[PDB]
Amino acid sequence: YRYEVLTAEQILQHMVECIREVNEVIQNPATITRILLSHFNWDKEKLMERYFDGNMPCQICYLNYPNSYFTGLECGHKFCMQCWSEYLTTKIMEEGMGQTISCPAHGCDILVDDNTVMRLITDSKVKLKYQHLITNSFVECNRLLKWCPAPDCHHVVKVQYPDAKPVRCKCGRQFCFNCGENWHDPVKCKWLKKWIKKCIAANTKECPKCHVTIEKDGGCNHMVCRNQNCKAEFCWVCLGPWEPHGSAWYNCNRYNRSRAALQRYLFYCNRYMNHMQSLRFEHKLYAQVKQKMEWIEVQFLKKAVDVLCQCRATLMYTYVFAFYLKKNNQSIIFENNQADLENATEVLSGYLERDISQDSLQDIKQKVQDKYRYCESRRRVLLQHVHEGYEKDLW
Ligand SMILES: [Zn+2]
């Protein structure tokens, strides 16, 4: 998938050109043509079809700078360099900041060409607040250009064609190019958005045999209650027993005036929400992973976390995929490839959260590796079979 990242500088460059191209025989001052293009959404044809048709002191600070700080606008008003700097800078701040800036006397209202607003502003954050502001239309109207999602990031990704794949901004944020959300791989874009419009989950649940209470620290859904009386184990999501889990016959990832909708809804959210809380917990696991690394030999251990973390992601997205799925013969398969993956994940999650330091030092490499290789290989079958899925339309 062909994709490129550009700085606010480069996109401004590109726009500047697209303007200059369009400047004959129209011959307008570059900034007026921008407004005009920006106004037509950058269809250049629609602007054209419509074009052939028809349509020695300084009076601000008061110090005397001799002649050389004095650049003026076309209206003959002549003000000093530092003074402009402040005028522009404070005018590009809220509120009412447009796609332009009028001359400061405000009597004349004749706008200040872009280039000089690039030359004269000093501290470059503001110079960025502008480049964004004047560029924003150029970018939004083109289908090969999308701004990067992060709030404080002014970069833009530019693609060959608008395909809904992941893109990385060196932001270092990654996102779907189509919908601009986080990368979703099993699920379709429209569905995700709908699911988002909806989205409790009970950090406190009680052990089913002894009715004791356990708040959840981590992150693994294989729980072993702490008691002398009952040392028994159970899944967090169904409060039923491990470990018939992830064997063919018990499946904890599958569902049976209609309240049924608001009932079964709670099935899939409860799951997606809980794989999230699970992913949250799995993340504070990184800081812990610098410690027990004690070089190549000893970093498979970031991977385990990388892979465990990755799988929690794909799982949430697989419940979103599944909720909007109407049952059919592939449903029953994907619903299985899921269960394999959910189990491979609870097993590895549970090994890094719990069973590992309660294990010896020699052994932990052999185990962690196999555990996350299988985990990752499960996760790929899930995905490859839904992909081949999307190809036949089967859903
Ligand atoms: Zn001045």
Ligand SMILES: [Zn+2]
């Ligand atoms: Zn003026």
Ligand SMILES: [Zn+2]
């Ligand atoms: Zn970014």
Ligand SMILES: [Zn+2]
């Ligand atoms: Zn998307």
Ligand SMILES: [Zn+2]
């Ligand atoms: Zn118990």
Ligand SMILES: [Zn+2]
């Ligand atoms: Zn369960």
